[PDB]
Design a protein around this ligand. Structure first.
Ligand SMILES: Nc1nc2c(ncn2[C@@H]2O[C@H](COP(=O)(O)OP(=O)(O)O)[C@@H](O)[C@H]2O)c(=O)[nH]1
Ligand SMILES: [Ca+2]
Ligand SMILES: [Mg+2]
Lengths: 69, 424
């Protein structure tokens, strides 16, 4: 019976620690995944804006070519 | 010098335990300061059974007060007889048990149990000849139920050859604090089946009914309920506290009352129960003593059979008439006493009456009808356990559902065992 009493309280400790461990790991996964997703969305937005700048440079360069002729 | 060590655990155990020491201190002439102011040597003849003698002719109760909360024990220390208890015998935690058997038995009470055993060891070392222990507790809460049975198991481990006696308060939906009381009671009953020699089953359902139906109290309180317990506890311990020949010690009481080791749960009864100056005759005491309305277990004696009976009469009365009335009840209702235990009714008489009464009678019955109490708890247990309701309070403390299943089976075996000897 003393052995069973030790096993019960150790089981309660193990489950409480496992709950803390699962909560910490799940949150860290979510915060890291969210950080990557938001940065990816911002990176895609900036890349499109940079492509607009590249298009504008092409347009302005195209005007100089025709002005020479 | 056959000493008894008293332990009270939890809210109910301490509140009932405090009233018990208040009642018997008055009977033995001990004032709240521990000084003797009686007028009869019969009060001090067996005073060492429950009291230690200190410097200055002071009588200190051999009582250990245990709780996982300081609240109730603080009230006891501030109560009428609070100062009479030994200050070092107050062992208490702070977290509490939350009406949870697992907390009292496995997690919260485990942290505190060793310090209680140190006080038990200190009290036992000074005993010339220790009879054993008496415990007051409830089975429906967490501390008295969970930690109380933990204490019993550990005390039996350290003192295997001593008698374990308990006053166990059974839960009831009529007087209920939480829905988990059937869980706590069922878990505790199996501990009592294995690790106690004598258990007085005090049913809060019976105490409420007596206060309501008999004493005409429309709104009974715990104080009213504990008044019945105090009177019952004084009566059942009369043979231990005063000179006598019958059931004078715990072991001899167990030999007379327990024909089979697991069937040691007693139905206590008290008379008179008056809602008051009228003198009560010896025939009236005997009729009320055996009446179901004066039983503290809420079991109908006519639904079962008496294995053994102990009767105690207190006051200046005709012992010849007591014998006639006791033989009259047995001879007029012999169908309710088992025929395979001859002369199973033993009667004792004490000259000193309880406070406020000229005549009193205390009933101690080992009846197979006590199975009704265990059936009632079992039905309430199963109604929730079949849906695993409220189990998370216990699995959160490390317990598994299998332990509940085993406790359920153990009490059903106890019920079946009582039914075996009711038909034999
Ligand atoms: N007769 C009686 N029963 C009580 C008293 N206090 C609590 N109870 C019962 O005991 C159960 C609750 O147990 P409790 O002692 O309060 O829990 P614990 O302090 O953790 O051991 C419930 O079934 C109540 O009906 C009391 O003063 N007298
Ligand atoms: Ca702690
Ligand atoms: Mg309580």
């Amino acid at each position: 019976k003393r052995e069973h009493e030790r096993e019960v309280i150790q089981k309660a400790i193990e489950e409480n620690n496992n709950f803390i461990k699962m909560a910490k790991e799940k949150l860290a996964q979510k915060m890291e995944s969210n950080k990557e997703n938001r940065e990816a969305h911002l990176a895609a937005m900036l890349e499109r804006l940079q492509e607009k700048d590249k298009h504008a440079e092409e347009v302005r360069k195209n005007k100089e070519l025709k002005e020479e002729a | 010098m056959r000493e008894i060590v008293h332990i009270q655990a939890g809210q109910c155990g301490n509140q009932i335990g405090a009233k018990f020491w208040e009642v018997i201190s008055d009977e033995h002439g001990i004032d709240p300061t521990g000084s003797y102011h009686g007028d009869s040597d019969l009060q001090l003849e067996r005073i060492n059974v429950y009291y230690n003698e200190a410097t200055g002719n002071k009588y200190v109760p051999r009582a250990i007060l245990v709780d996982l909360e300081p609240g109730t024990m603080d009230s006891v220390r501030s109560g009428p007889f609070g100062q009479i208890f030994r200050p070092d015998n107050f062992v208490f935690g702070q977290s509490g048990a939350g009406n949870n058997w697992a907390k009292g038995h496995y997690t919260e009470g485990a942290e505190l149990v060793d310090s209680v055993l140190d006080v038990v060891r200190k009290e036992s070392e000074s005993c010339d000849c220790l009879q054993g222990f008496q415990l007051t507790h409830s089975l429906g809460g967490g501390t008295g139920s969970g930690m109380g049975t933990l204490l019993i198991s550990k005390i039996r481990e350290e003192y295997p050859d001593r008698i374990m006696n308990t006053f166990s308060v059974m839960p009831s939906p009529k007087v209920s604090d939480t829905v988990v009381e059937p869980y706590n009671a069922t878990l505790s009953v199996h501990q009592l089946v294995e690790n106690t020699d004598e258990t007085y089953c005090i049913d809060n359902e019976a105490l409420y009914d007596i206060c309501f139906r008999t004493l005409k109290l429309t709104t009974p309180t715990y104080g009213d309920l504990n008044h019945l317990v105090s009177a019952t506890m004084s009566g059942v311990t009369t043979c231990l506290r005063f000179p006598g020949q019958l059931n004078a010690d715990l072991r001899k009481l167990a030999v007379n009352m327990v024909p089979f080791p697991r069937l040691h749960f007693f139905m206590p009864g008290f008379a008179p129960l008056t809602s008051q100056y009228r003198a009560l005759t010896v025939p009236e005491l005997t009729q009320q003593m055996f009446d179901s309305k004066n039983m503290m277990a809420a079991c109908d004696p006519r639904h079962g059979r008496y294995l053994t009976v102990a009767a105690i009469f207190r006051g200046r009365m005709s012992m010849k008439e007591v014998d006639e009335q006791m033989l009259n009840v047995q001879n007029k209702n012999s169908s309710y006493f088992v025929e395979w235990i001859p002369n199973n009714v033993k009667t004792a008489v004490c000259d000193i009456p309880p406070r406020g009464l000229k005549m009193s009678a205390t009933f101690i019955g080992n009846s197979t009808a006590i199975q009704e109490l265990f059936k009632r708890i079992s039905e309430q247990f199963t109604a929730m356990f079949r849906r695993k309701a409220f189990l998370h309070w216990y699995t959160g403390e490390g317990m598994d559902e299998m332990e509940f299943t085993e406790a359920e089976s153990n009490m059903n075996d106890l019920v079946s065992e009582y039914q075996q000897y009711q038909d034999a």
